[PDB]
Symmetry: D2
Subunit: 116 residues, 4 copies
């Protein structure tokens, strides 16, 4: 509930199914520790990555495997992935939606942050 | 010089060449009267649409014929065109660049306004 | 259900509440006939604009009053509105989500089209 | 000449001036080794990062320090930075322009690749 990822294909106007997503948290050592992973559903959404308790203050990285998505459609895209890095929960708990809009040579990402 | 249009293709990663662009000025009776037009260059740009003398304050519309572009590439598009409607020079003349980034089912338009 | 509009503020990362939306349909005469209107909810969404029966083949125009939104926040934005023009239902009935992402000098719009 | 970065500010409608940009090359041990850096000009552009000789095939990362830009403007940002990771010249050398459009809670990056 605190962290959701949503992915859309701007060529077809359709959610992207089965796209891999990895989340990492920046370590006290400054390394990227694996934190959660999953794949998008038929709606293009990935829920259930974490809980309010586990999702503490930190720097988080959401890495979306956009290249495998395009390659499965026959396309050699520009980007290796889409990677979103942000500080979370530093003013207390929030709910974060990380959205990505994909084209072969472009991507856009927006964050919708709300207070529960 | 006061108005320029620059268009990019997010599918191919290239400027959009030979895209038609039409510019209109809102008339007093709230209709759109045609004002200038052209086709983007090989750099995706359209210069020379108007002059400082002619580009007075008012409401302007820029229409980019995105549907014809995508049809020429054999790609099904969503929109009939991409539009930008804006008020010009409300606080003095400026240079306006209308930058458009095109995908078949999405577009963004940004104004880069320099004094 | 066949037509939904969703609007987000890219400065704050938040849905835009109370934004006016007007829909028009291109006439047999080639005029823009008023078709439906409403305002976005606290989620930034506007539902219930039309029905499958009324929403026939045609060229439709969705006009979002982004300028009033910015002016209420003290900002003089570049665009007078955000206007999305598209052919609908020409290959049969579909569900359309028209999304807009707003900044004072920029907007993005994407269409998500699905088959029920 | 082979790599250029261009950055626009969607809030103010201007190029982003004095934004730091760092470029890295993936090393064989899968770490990022620093390769070039600079600050955007008054046109929002950063030229001269590398040369055709040095810009060989491989995986490159471009980091744009968007957070520092927004902090300088007194605007709260979401992201730590904007990134682009790409494979270069897989089918020959090309000119790459990485165009980034920035808002405090959203960004887009587009590659304009010309031969």
């Amino acid at each position: 509930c605190p962290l959701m990822v949503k992915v859309l294909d701007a060529v077809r106007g359709s959610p992207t199914i089965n796209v891999a997503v990895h989340v990492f948290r920046k370590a006290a050592d400054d390394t990227w520790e694996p934190f959660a992973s999953g794949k998008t559903s038929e709606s293009g959404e990935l829920h259930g990555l974490t809980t309010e308790e586990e999702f503490v203050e930190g720097i988080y990285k959401v890495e979306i495997d956009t290249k495998s998505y395009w390659k499965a459609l026959g396309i050699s895209p520009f980007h290796e992935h889409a990677e979103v890095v942000f500080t979370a929960n530093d003013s207390g708990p929030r709910r974060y939606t990380i959205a990505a809009l994909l084209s072969p040579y472009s991507y856009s990402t927006t964050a919708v942050v709300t207070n529960p």
